[PDB]
Amino acid sequence: GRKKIQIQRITDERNRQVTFTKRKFGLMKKAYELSVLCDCEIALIIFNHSNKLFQYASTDMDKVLLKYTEYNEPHESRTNADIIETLRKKGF
Amino acid sequence: GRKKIQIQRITDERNRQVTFTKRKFGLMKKAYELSVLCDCEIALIIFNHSNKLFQYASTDMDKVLLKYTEYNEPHESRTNADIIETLRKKG
C-alpha cells in the first residue's frame, strides 16, 4: 500500500467497505490459485460486519460442505489465535 | 517470486506440498487480516490432493457453519469460473 496499516479494526465505515471488497477479492484469488496449483477443493464463508453472507467455492460449495460432513475430524483446525501464534514464532 | 509461474497443476509432488503449505498459510493470514480490519467472521475448508481436510475459522467454525444454515440464499456467490472471468477483464 501507500502506507503500512496495522492489523486493527477500521473505524471509518467507507474505508471499511472499500478494504472489504478489495481484500475479499484478493482472498478469493489466493484461494483460486491454491486450488489449481495444488489440486485443492476449497469453500470459504464470509459474514461481513452487517452479517451479509459471501461465499466462494473452487467448483461447488454444496459438494464441499457435504464432503466436510462425512469427515469425522479435521486433520488440521486453525483459528485467529493460532495464526497470531504462528506469526509470533515466525518473528521478523 | 524469483519467477512468474502459470496457474496450473504442480506435478512434482514435493514442489506441490511445499507450495501447498506456504500458500495455505498465506491465505489464512489474509483471512485473519480481513476478519480484524473489517470486523468479519470467516470459515475456510480445504481438501488437498490426498483428501485431507484442513480448516480455519476467525473464531468458531461450528458457529459459522450453524449461521450458514440460517440463510436460504448467499448474498454473493463466486466460483473459480467467476475469478477467472474477472482476471480476463484485467489482462
Binding site: L66, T69, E73 | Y68
Partner: peptide
Amino acid sequence: GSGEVKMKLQEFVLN
C-alpha cells in the same frame, strides 16, 4: 457438538 453441527449442515444442504 461438531457431529450435531455437521448433521444440521447435512440436512440443510441436502434439503
